[PDB]
């Protein structure tokens, strides 16, 4: 969102849930920012280099947070043969 001259307004741009594509509000205290280590040969998790997922507090209350990360991480190559599209 911007004015006529392209100057930015709207003092912050909010995070969005990576499962349901909805806005994380400033008062969603059940929302969670998952940080996953990136790894290289012979283990040795690289410090400070992540794969990050955000989950809204709606999803976690519904009990869908586990099934969401199984989809969210299998599509990124973090898992294999754990989440199945066809139920």
């Amino acid at each position: 969102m911007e004015n006529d001259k392209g100057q930015l307004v709207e003092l912050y741009v909010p995070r969005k849930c990576s499962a349901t594509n909805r806005i994380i509000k400033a008062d969603d205290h059940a929302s969670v920012q998952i940080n996953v280590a990136k790894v290289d040969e012979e283990g040795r998790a690289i410090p400070g280099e992540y794969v990050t997922y955000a989950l809204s507090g709606y999803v976690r209350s519904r009990g869908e947070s586990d099934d969401s990360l199984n989809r969210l991480a299998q599509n990124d190559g973090l898992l294999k043969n754990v989440w199945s599209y066809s139920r």
């Binding site: 349901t20 594509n21 909805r22 709606y58 999803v59 519904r62 869908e64």
Partner: protein, 129 residues
């Protein structure tokens, strides 16, 4: 009984956006539902949808991509003169600068914005945002 299949379809979509789903299955399907989903698709409100061919009426599976707040139907389909459209967009759209009211003109099913530049009017179907 079923009075309008468009109201059922838009109720099904609206219930699954709320729950967090990424797909719906609606039944039955009609040309009006196909065109209404096509107007929703070209503005980016829904993803891809596939039409399953029964021999009866067909079903549709529609992929949802978040970013949809409400799709609703207006019943009855009121007649809308070309000067009454800004009385509807002011009533049931969240702001003057996004959102669409889908009408049914003799030039076809279309949202209110390019009914204006086509300079046509007709009956009202509903709204999306």
């Amino acid at each position: 009984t079923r009075s309008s299949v468009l109201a059922d379809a838009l109720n099904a979509i609206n219930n699954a956006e709320k729950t967090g789903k990424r797909q719906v299955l609606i039944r039955p399907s009609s040309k009006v539902i196909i065109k209404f989903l096509q107007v929703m698709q070209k503005h980016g409100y829904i993803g891809e949808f596939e039409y399953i061919d029964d021999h009866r009426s067909g079903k549709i599976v529609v992929q949802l991509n978040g970013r949809l707040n409400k799709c609703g139907v207006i019943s009855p389909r009121f007649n809308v003169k070309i000067g009454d459209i800004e009385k509807w967009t002011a009533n049931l759209l969240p702001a003057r600068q996004f959102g669409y009211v889908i009408l049914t003109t003799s030039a076809g099913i279309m949202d209110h914005e390019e009914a204006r530049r086509k300079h046509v009017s007709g009956k009202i179907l509903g709204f999306v945002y």
